[PDB]
Amino acid sequence: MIIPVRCFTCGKIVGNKWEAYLGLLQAEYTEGDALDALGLKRYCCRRMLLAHVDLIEKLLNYAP
C-alpha cells in the first residue's frame, strides 16, 4: 500500500525514493535511466521500485 522503508534483501533504504521515481519518469527519463540516477544498482533493490503498486492513493478518496 505504501513504499517499504527498506529493501527486503539488502537492507538499503528505499522508502524516500518513491516521489523521486515518479518525478524522473514524469520528466520522460526512460525507466532504466531513472533507476540508475536514483542510484539503485543491485537487481534486488531495483525490484523494489520497479514492481510497486501504490494503493494508498486510492484509500484517500473515502471521506473520514
Partner 1 sequence: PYANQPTVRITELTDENVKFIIENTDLAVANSIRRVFIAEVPIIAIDWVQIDANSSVLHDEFIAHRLGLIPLTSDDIVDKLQYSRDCTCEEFCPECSVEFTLDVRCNEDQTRHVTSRDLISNSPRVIPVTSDDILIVKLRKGQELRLRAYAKKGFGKEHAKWNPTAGVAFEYDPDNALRHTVYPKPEEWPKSEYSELDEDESQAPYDPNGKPERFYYNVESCGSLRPETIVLSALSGLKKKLSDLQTQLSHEIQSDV
> Does residue 42 belong to the site contacting partner 1 (CB under 8 A)?
yes
Question: What residue 1 binds from partner 1, Zn ion, none (CB within 5 to 8 A, per partner kind)?
Answer: partner 1
Cα–Cα distance, 64 to 49 (Å, whole number):
29
> Does residue 23 belong to the site contacting partner 1 (CB under 8 A)?
no
> Does residue 6 belong to the site contacting partner 1 (CB under 8 A)?
yes
> Does residue 27 belong to the site contacting partner 1 (CB under 8 A)?
no
Cα–Cα distance, 63 to 28 (Å, whole number):
34
User: Cβ distance 43 to 8 under 8 Å?
Assistant: no
The CA angle 44-36-25, to the nearest 5 degrees, is: 105
> Does residue 37 belong to the site contacting Zn ion (CB under 5 A)?
no
Which spans of this chain sit near partner 1 (rule: CB under 8 A)?
A: 1-3, 5-6, 10-13, 15-20, 42, 56, 59-60, 63-64
